[PDB]
Amino acid sequence: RQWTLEDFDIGRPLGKGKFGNVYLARERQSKFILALKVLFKTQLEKAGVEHQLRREVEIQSHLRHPNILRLYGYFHDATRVYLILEYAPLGTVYRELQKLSRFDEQRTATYITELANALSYCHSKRVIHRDIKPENLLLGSNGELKIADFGWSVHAPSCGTLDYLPPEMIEGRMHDEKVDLWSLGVLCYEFLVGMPPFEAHTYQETYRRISRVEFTFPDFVTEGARDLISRLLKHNASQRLTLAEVLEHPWIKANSS
Ligand SMILES: Nc1ncnc(NCCc2cnc(NC(=O)Nc3cccc(C(F)(F)F)c3)s2)c1Br
Known about the structure:
- This protein is of the alpha+beta class and about 260 residues long.
- It folds into 2 domains: about 5-90, Phosphorylase Kinase, domain 1, CATH 3.30.200; about 90-255, Transferase(Phosphotransferase) domain 1 (Transferase(Phosphotransferase), domain 1), CATH 1.10.510.10.
- Helices cover about 40% and strands about 15% of the residues.
- The protein has helices at about 40-45, 50-60, 95-100, 105-125, 165-170, 180-195, 205-210, 225-230, 245, 250-255, and strands spanning about 10-15, 20-25, 35-40, 70-75, 80-85, 135-140, 145.
- The protein is globular and about 55 Å long.
- The ligand Nc1ncnc(NCCc2cnc(NC(=O)Nc3cccc(C(F)(F)F)c3)s2)c1Br binds next to β1, β3, α2 and β5.
- Belongs to the protein kinase superfamily. Ser/Thr protein kinase family. Aurora subfamily.
């Protein structure tokens, strides 16, 4: 089917995203509940990212995993581009983290497990996400973590704050699948602490701290969590833990559900 906007009943705004807003939507024939992100053609052309969006649709057409948000397809009119997306009823992990300030070890390890599984699937079909962050993680009906937004994704090897990016990427160097592993380490830190490890008021300071791998743990972080994060956040990408090593880490096994 060739989708048009007239096929959908538009609901309430679900959030404000990269190049436009995400709305709740219902397909008129089947009454199916979904999400539509509305992007503008001018904004996509001016950024020179139209090929990246075409790649995302392509990449998402092949990917099938319960911990990955579905992109069903897209369509456009005169001015706007519409992404047909799976609805995530429990919102962003970003919103959940603001609500709870920080997650307990049980919730964190469960998310990391789910993340790792999703990434393990992506890396086997050789896809790197490159944009792992709380705002690109959503929660399904049963509170399961779902990864979204493959706009910055590439095949290995090869917008916002610098917080989740590894030293190789910020320095404009060569990078592979191990970037998602660094971002997972940043995630795990932020989930438990409430803020990312290299957080700063300035871009330049954040750049300094990532380059040096300059970060400390607060007193309440356990040694098990400290171990995982330290072994994920290593300047040398080849020295970082693999996803299987993460899923088999003592602290993950002990706290994950
Ligand atoms: N509760 C919810 N339930 C379901 N979805 C929600 N939000 C949508 C999450 C997304 C998933 N995928 C996305 N994709 C992109 O937008 N990609 C994108 C965007 C701009 C430019 C580009 C590019 F052109 F630069 F690549 C690529 S946004 C929410 Br809140």
